[PDB]
Curated annotation (Swiss-Prot), chain B:
It is found in: Cell inner membrane; Bacterial flagellum basal body. This is Flagellar motor switch protein FliG. It comes from Thermotoga maritima (strain ATCC 43589 / DSM 3109 / JCM 10099 / NBRC 100826 / MSB8). Belongs to the FliG family. One of the proteins that forms a switch complex that is proposed to be located at the base of the basal body. This complex interacts with chemotaxis proteins (such as CheY) in addition to contacting components of the motor that determine the direction of flagellar rotation. The lineage of its organism: Bacteria, Thermotogati, Thermotogota, Thermotogae, Thermotogales.
Length: 101, 89
């Protein structure tokens, strides 16, 4: 039941490993549908240059379709799912939730 | 009217001025709707690495939709028109 905002509960190392399997177009389309907070969490884990290429693309693109944004997000979630099986995804320090049955 | 195959008639310098303005994704989708001689013309105008960066995209992408390929070719034609009314072409 993982959704795109759950990326906020993964450690910096996981996000960096996930950023290597996505291309520039998919990472940018997904960001147009992210919280200001997930955005900074994402920019913080990219090199100085990789981030500048990203801002280039974001300015270059313009108006995009909602469904294209949702598709880019699912493609990024499937990568995470794949890297999890190879044991490379780790939940952050305070990234756990208290539940009630 | 200017269609995508008419790019086979711009010279090397003009093509280098166009490749500068287009992003990786638009070029990959666009070339997926090109003849073999238009692909060769564009490839001899981009660096050994740029063509490597393009192979990656092309392979990372997989199957694509005809509407997106058409949308990518139109973006490039729009860039070409901007460059023409300027005088840079």
């Amino acid at each position: 039941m993982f959704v795109f905002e759950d990326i906020l509960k993964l450690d910096d190392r996981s996000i960096q490993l996930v950023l290597r399997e996505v291309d520039t177009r998919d990472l940018a389309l997904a960001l147009k549908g992210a919280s200001d907070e997930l955005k900074e969490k994402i920019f913080k884990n990219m090199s100085k240059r990789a981030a500048a290429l990203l801002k280039d693309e974001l300015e270059y693109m313009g108006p995009v379709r909602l469904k294209d944004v949702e598709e880019a997000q699912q493609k990024i979630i499937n990568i995470i799912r794949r890297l999890e099986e190879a044991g490379e995804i780790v939940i952050a320090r305070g990234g756990g939730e208290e539940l009630i049955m």
